[PDB]
Design a binder for this molecule. Structure first.
Ligand SMILES: [Cl-]
Lengths: 594, 591, 102
């Protein structure tokens, strides 16, 4: 009677085993993205779910990607190269022309410089892995191998010699030789570890935004039928405005039916090998503005404002973007606000915020040399290419800068110097760039109805500071006049010195906040925001909505990873199933066996 | 200044390291689960990891590093399990297979002890053959295991074998972590193979090792449309194993077989990728020509023939003068005293595989109408119960007469050119011929032929050891018949130290044992096969007897057999191998 | 060119299925196999054709059927009778010259 019970248990046991050998098996993998920026090098640790399927190989589930930890800010790659050039190319290597061919005698010393930084990053990555994973997770993580993607953004672009390429060969060698004691099998290749441009950074940040917000996926949001009778499909993607430390990127979907001028182009993510063919076609307007970065805009703004007769008088530059009662030495050097309320300006050539734009605007730069107009475009932006470096950045006949806190004048100068200059800086026509030269040109010829997400620490602090002092409603949705009225009030504040330190005291006793090195010049970011919104509002097509985001909420509510280029970089590798399977699993860390 | 060049060279060296292909050693294991034994085979291969191209094996690098101990056959695991749970008379009476689902952990229990012995033996071979640097590479890459069962487990006709294979792969996928060798398998690598498939794999082994099989063709023909039709210059194989005999050789160029038989195309069968020149072969596998079944069938038909059976005495011309045994197809044990001991157990009867095959219980007999008649007419009656089916009637003793020519004429009429052959159902891996005689009369080829198999080689080596055949013997029929006639005229003499085979004219002797008492039948099968091959419209360019192939250096690369061919049919399909061996890999087993 | 009895059976099977609206790019049912791979087929009708010289019988192989090793399903895509965009068609195909009218 109970013999049937024992028969069915036997049959079920065999079906359980058969299912186990025919079905996909899941396993955890760690992925590392080392963010080598302008002023710092930082590790980012991710976890992803891998799926191993009979006769199909192994792949990553892209929706499983999550940041588990961001590391300490170590020295920038530029710091490694400068210390090496300061020791072996002697002194004044960036003043007197150097024979780069002679520097080949000092390759092991470059390696030692790079070894010091890589050891610090490896130790830090291992510390994050050890603190975040339980024992079961570690076994899976250690067995699969750890792909490392080290990408440098700004900092190392401007040497114009063999240094950067040589450094990258040494960095991958160090990453491919991790300490065996910890058991973490880090590895890389020249396709994962390489420098990335500003425009590529924008495309990666656009992918990150659309991945995290679940807008990017294999299934299309909508399909259309063209003139030939062919079904054309697309996702409903959001655009991104990312204002970083070194540049600003604007990346948004091309409006359906747009006929672009011959001289600019839509960037197709499939053609550029950023998204696979199985994803709906994505055509974007991609723009990276060198002068709109937090650091570069600060430098250029002072250079142009303080050379204008309306603002410079008897060695005093009256700055409308700075608070009344605030003053500093007249230079584009890094500013430090001190407890007594004074400003300390770092005069070191390497700390001058005009340095990347001044080295970019050089006769020695092929980007400038190759076109007749380019040299003049620099000169009209107060950076003369024929001038030597230190003189090229000097603010002439100027001793001090005093704040006047006049928001309307601040907007007018931001508009004429930064957003719509008489002459824009040269167009970038690399594959990742649409080839636009200005913000007005973008919204005049290529405006779209796609929603827009505004990102970047300074852009968010500009809106949140106004909300905190109750000058902007919490429900603010991008109205230009609402923003300008709020910033006019805040920007009229007086710097007051108290026992606890300097404070920004708002008019009509509305309140105050501490004055510091990150917020002393926030009014310029408020003016850049007003200007950007005005140019977007003047476009034929208007974004369906505009939002300011610090993070994107995941399915469970908590963010899975950060906004920025990091997720996009992982995706552009992991989504190409066959290629990823070959590099990450077939070759893998075992490719390093010697 | 020369200091600059050291720097420039150092950077180029590192740049070369990150752009070029890297080689790494891998171990691969083939478990040969045969009729009487299960044996591990350990191989080494060079893998190549190429930027953006993944990882592949260099097929020319495949080398055998060790073959292990012969453990019990899979048939033993199942037979012991059936004895305990189905009852001791399962071979001779009906069994309700459904009831046996209650004893799945006990089947696992039997397979576990055998797999643990094989795992320990494989690890022992790896540890004795590899240096510390080689071990690091081998342990890191993972160790693909290909366990294939051949004969001995094909005739159960229930759910047992498929369930046993599920349990074996589960055992392989759970190696001991202590030794660090990452063994792993999947249902594509570990599976049963048919006799005709063993033939195709042995054919691939022979041609790979001898360097005849390669991407670069030996000759091309231009078709009517100007398209090159290319081929390799492949050698054929004759393998006489313990449980079956296989014959696989290239189809004669410019021939087409009629609609009753078919050429096997290796690419169509997915044994060789499309980048290899097209290979069409004549493929046959006969259970009745295996050493064990041919011995049983020879006695069954000879001892029911009035010329040989008289007054209860069967005069056997393939056995030596002075040798005698009780009349049955039971396993013979030559005893220390010189007498033969015949095991009467149904399980040890040499006719057991043919009798289980020629049964109403076998669905294969119902596959083709004439099958049952071809069984009956060869004295294996499917209507008779098992014990009656194998019994040699009106026969008490088998006495040897040592008449080589009569032994040959009986091998011709029973085994090689029977008037009505035993049934052989076609399958994807076979051509459909049911007789060796038909093969050479209708589909002969000029391709060279390599004769392999333990017993085939022992027959030739025995005649060479006694200096009856020249060391440089190359297949001449009459030279062989002459040597074998003299050896087979030997008398069995019982001495104090045991029975001996005494050659005529005091020209030597050797001990008589269970493995050589009936060797003259193999010598007769060899003479008969050579005769049929020589009478073909096309004769092989040459004939050789071989066990292994020498590498490009002079040392043996690997053994002849189905094992190298099994590895190749997986490793040659680059994309599929990369996904299964490296992407999924042993990491697929992570819990 | 000349065509055999078995080839005449496969062509008649294609004719029936085309005219009956059974053959086409749209499958009648998709099944999830052991691996989780969607296997799609048309709902093909079999044909019994008794001609003057031979009789043909052609019908789709029963789903999940294991044929004896000695016989084989004819795959129409493998025989280049149907293109790859058509659902996979595995058939039992038989031609008997002894069952023809003459
Ligand atoms: Cl035949």
């Amino acid at each position: 009677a109970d013999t049937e019970k024992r028969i069915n248990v036997g049959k079920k046991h065999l079906q359980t085993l058969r299912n186990l050998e025919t079905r996909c098996h899941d396993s955890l993998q760690a992925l590392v993205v080392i963010d080598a920026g302008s002023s710092s090098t930082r590790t980012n640790v991710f976890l992803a779910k891998t799926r191993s399927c009979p006769n199909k190989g192994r792949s990553i589930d892209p929706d499983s990607i999550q940041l588990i930890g961001a590391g300490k800010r170590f020295a920038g790659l530029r710091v490694v190269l400068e210390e090496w050039l300061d020791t072996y190319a002697g002194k004044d290597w960036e003043s007197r022309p150097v024979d780069a061919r002679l520097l080949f005698q000092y390759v092991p010393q470059m390696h030692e410089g790079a070894k010091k930084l890589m050891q610090l990053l490896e130790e830090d990555t291992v510390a994050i892995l050890d603190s975040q994973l339980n024992e079961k997770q570690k076994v899976q993580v250690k067995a699969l191998g750890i792909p490392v993607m080290l990408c440098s953004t700004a900092g190392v672009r401007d040497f114009h010699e063999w240094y950067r390429d040589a450094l990258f060969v040494l960095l991958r060698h160090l990453i491919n030789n991790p300490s065996p004691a910890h058991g973490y099998k880090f590895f890389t290749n020249p396709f994962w570890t390489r420098p990335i441009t500003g425009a590529e950074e924008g495309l990666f940040a656009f992918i990150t935004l659309n991945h995290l917000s679940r807008r990017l996926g294999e299934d299309p949001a909508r399909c259309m039928i063209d003139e030939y009778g062919v079904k054309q499909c697309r996702n409903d993607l959001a655009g991104v405005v990312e204002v970083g430390g070194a540049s600003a990127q604007i990346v948004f979907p091309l409006q359906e039916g747009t006929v672009l001028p011959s001289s600019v182009r839509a960037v197709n993510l499939q053609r550029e090998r950023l998204l696979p063919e199985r994803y709906p076609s994505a055509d974007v307007v991609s723009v990276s503005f060198m002068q709109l970065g937090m650091a570069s805009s600060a430098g250029l703004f002072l250079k142009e404002l303080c050379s204008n007769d309306e603002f410079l008088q008897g060695g005093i530059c009256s700055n409308p973007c700075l608070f009344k009662g605030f003053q500093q030495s007249c230079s584009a050097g890094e500013v430090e606000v001190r407890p007594d309320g004074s400003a300390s300006v770092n005069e070191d050539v390497r700390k001058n915020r005009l340095k990347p734009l001044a080295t970019y605007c050089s006769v020695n730069n092929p980007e400038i040399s190759f076109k007749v107009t380019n040299e003049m475009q620099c000169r009209e932006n107060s950076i003369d290419p024929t001038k030597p470096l230190a003189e090229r950045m000097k603010i002439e006949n100027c001793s001090i800068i005093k704040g006047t806190g006049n928001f309307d004048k601040c907007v007018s100068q931001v508009e004429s110097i930064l957003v719509a200059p008489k002459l824009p800086l040269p167009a970038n026509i690399e594959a990742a760039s649409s080839g636009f030269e200005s913000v007005d040109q973008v919204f005049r010829f290529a405006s779209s109805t796609a929603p827009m997400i505004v990102t970047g620490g300074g852009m968010l602090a500009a809106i949140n500071t106004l909300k905190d002092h109750r000058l902007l409603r919490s429900d603010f949705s991008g109205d230009v006049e609402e923003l300008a009225e709020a910033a006019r009030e805040f920007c009229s504040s007086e710097v007051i010195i108290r026992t606890d330190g300097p404070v920004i005291q708002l008019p009509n006793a509305r309140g105050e906040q501490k004055l510091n090195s990150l917020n002393f010049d926030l009014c310029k970011t408020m003016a850049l925001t007003v200007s950007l919104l005005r140019h977007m509002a003047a476009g034929e097509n208007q974004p369906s909505f505009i939002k300011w985001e610090k993070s994107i909420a995941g399915p469970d509510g908590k963010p899975l990873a950060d906004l920025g280029w990091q997720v996009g970089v992982i995706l552009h590798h992991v989504l190409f199933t066959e290629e990823w399977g070959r590099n990450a699993y077939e070759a893998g860390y075992s490719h390093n066996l010697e």
